[PDB]
Amino acid sequence: IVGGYTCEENSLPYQVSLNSGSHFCGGSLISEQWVVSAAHCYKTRIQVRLGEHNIKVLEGNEQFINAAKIIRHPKYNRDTLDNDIMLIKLSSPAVINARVSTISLPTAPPAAGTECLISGWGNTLSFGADYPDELKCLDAPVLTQAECKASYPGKITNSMFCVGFLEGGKDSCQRDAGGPVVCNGQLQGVVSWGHGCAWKNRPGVYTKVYNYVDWIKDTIAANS
């Protein structure tokens, strides 16, 4: 997250880190056994890390659980990034407490101007690299679809929306992919892609979670 702030330590019990070799993507806990992330984060061997604020210090609330099933959207396209969403089923259920808890699936579509919270352990710099131990947060509004398409001509599919600022300086970045965009107490977005990070007229592009609520519910039910 470029241009954000350090998140309060007890405030994002739904944020997860995906770890295989390194911390490589984020995600969101949506039920005791299931996490939502980006299809481009797919790997076969994933440890899901719950209850974290600082990815380098044990605070006492960590639960690190292997991924048993990893299910990319059945119409994911890696060349366009269409349908960039995935589900992970944990090998054991998470234990729900103050620091490990679920984020609600959306019950209405996201509208332009709605204020959201984007979070992750991604790069904090547009110049060079500084990957933070503590989780970062960005307050950002949903942009108009017209602004989104004008920023990325011919690249915005039905699965995608833009959240952030056309002025540069405030955006998600590398290592943030898969992580949450939360608006009105519900998961509306998954961090996906952008041209650079926090560059002028290149807002972040996010997967519109509201389009997949039935897929998520059906997938969970079929893999129970």
Partner 1 sequence: HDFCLVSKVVGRCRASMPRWWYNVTDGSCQLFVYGGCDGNSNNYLTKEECLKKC
The two three-digit tokens of residue 121, written as one number: 């352990």
Which residue lies nearer to partner 1 by CB, 80 or 101?
Answer: 80
Q: Is 59 in the site for Ca ion (CB under 5 A)?
A: yes
Which one of 45, 75, 195, 217 is in contact with partner 1 (CB under 8 A)?
195
Q: Is 167 in the site for Ca ion (CB under 5 A)?
A: no
Q: Smallest distance, Å, CB 218 to partner 1?
A: 26
- What is the DSSP annotation of 51-98? S-SBTTS--S--EEEEEEEEEE-TT--TTT-TT--EEEEESSPPPPBT
Cα-trace Rg, the chain: 16
Which residue lies nearer to Ca ion by CB, 19 or 80?
Answer: 19
The two three-digit tokens of residue 138, written as one number: 């960005």
The two three-digit tokens of residue 78, written as one number: 């890696």
Q: Considering CB distances under 5 to 8 angstroms, the limit depending on partner class, which of Ca ion, partner 1, none binds residue 52?
A: Ca ion
Which residue lies nearer to partner 1 by CB, 84 or 143?
Answer: 84
Per CB under 8 A, contacts with partner 1 among 146-175 are: 172-175
Q: Smallest distance, Å, CB 152 to partner 1?
A: 9
Q: Considering CB distances under 5 to 8 angstroms, the limit depending on partner class, which of Ca ion, partner 1, none binds residue 59?
A: Ca ion
Residue 110, CA distances (Å) to 102, 116, 158 in order: 19, 10, 13
Which residue lies nearer to partner 1 by CB, 33 or 123?
Answer: 123
Name the one range near Ca ion by CB under 5 A: 34-42, 53-61, 157-165, 202-210.
53-61
Which residue lies nearer to Ca ion by CB, 50 or 183?
Answer: 50
Which residue lies nearer to partner 1 by CB, 103 or 177?
Answer: 177
Per CB under 8 A, contacts with partner 1 among 88-147 are: 122-123, 129, 131
Interface positions with Ca ion (CB under 5 A):
52, 54, 59
Interface positions with partner 1 (CB under 8 A):
21-25, 38, 40-41, 78, 81, 122-123, 129, 131, 172-178, 191-195, 197, 204
